[PDB]
Structures are given as structure tokens and as C-alpha cells.
Ligand binder design. Structure first.
Ligand SMILES: [Cl-]
Length: 124
């Protein structure tokens, strides 16, 4: 079974680019991060910062998570992110995503020792 921290890395980290450079970014990344294997994951955000910078959020601003848990943290800085969401043309096995690039604060839930991100809650 994949660890929670490793699942977060796979689903949400893309430190190899500064930003989505095209409309096809999400189609490509959703496929390659194995988020379309058996069904199309409906919504998923990638963060274009170093892993260290995203881990560091777990010692930044403590805020409520949407679900009411208290282990969420909001980045002090905005970060380069890309939201990927299925479009109306999407139909497994031919998933199709809209790519929306933005610079926003991220909110992550953190757990463990080391205390690291395990869920992507939202951007602001
Ligand atoms: Cl997400």
C-alpha cells in the first residue's frame, strides 16, 4: 500500500516545471501520475514548487480543514499551481481535463513523524 505521504507526492507535486505551459498539461499529468487508470479522477491540483517548500507548509499557518479537522496549514506565500478538472467531453477511458494555472496559497493537511503533507485541502 502506498504511504499517505507518498500518495500526496504522486498526486500533488510537480517541481519539474514553473507552471503549466499549455492546455494539454492536465491530460498528460493525470495520465502519467496514474490518476486515470481505472476511472478519471475528477479534480486534482499540482503544485509547481520544490518538495521542501511544500513540506515546509506544515509549520506555517494552522487553519481549519474543510472537514473540520485541525491539522491543516496555509502557506504564507502564494505558489504556482495547476488545477486539473474533468470537462464534459471526458469519458473513461478517454479522460479529458481543463488546465487552469494560478498563483495561490495552498492549504494542506499534515500528519506523521516527520510531519508532512498527506492531503491537499484547497487553494486560496
Ligand atoms: Cl486536489
Amino acid at each position: 500500500k502506498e504511504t499517505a505521504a507518498a500518495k500526496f507526492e504522486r498526486q500533488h507535486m510537480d517541481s519539474s516545471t514553473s507552471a503549466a505551459s499549455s492546455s494539454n498539461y492536465c491530460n498528460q499529468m493525470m495520465k502519467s501520475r496514474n490518476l486515470t487508470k481505472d476511472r478519471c479522477k475528477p479534480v486534482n491540483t499540482f503544485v509547481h514548487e520544490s518538495l521542501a517548500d511544500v513540506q515546509a507548509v506544515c509549520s506555517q499557518k494552522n487553519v481549519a480543514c474543510k472537514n473540520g479537522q485541525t491539522n491543516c496549514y496555509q502557506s504564507y506565500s502564494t505558489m504556482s499551481i495547476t488545477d486539473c478538472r474533468e470537462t464534459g467531453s471526458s469519458k473513461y477511458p478517454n479522460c479529458a481535463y481543463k488546465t487552469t494555472q494560478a498563483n495561490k496559497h495552498i492549504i494542506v493537511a499534515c500528519e506523521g513523524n516527520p510531519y508532512v503533507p498527506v492531503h491537499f485541502d484547497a487553494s486560496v
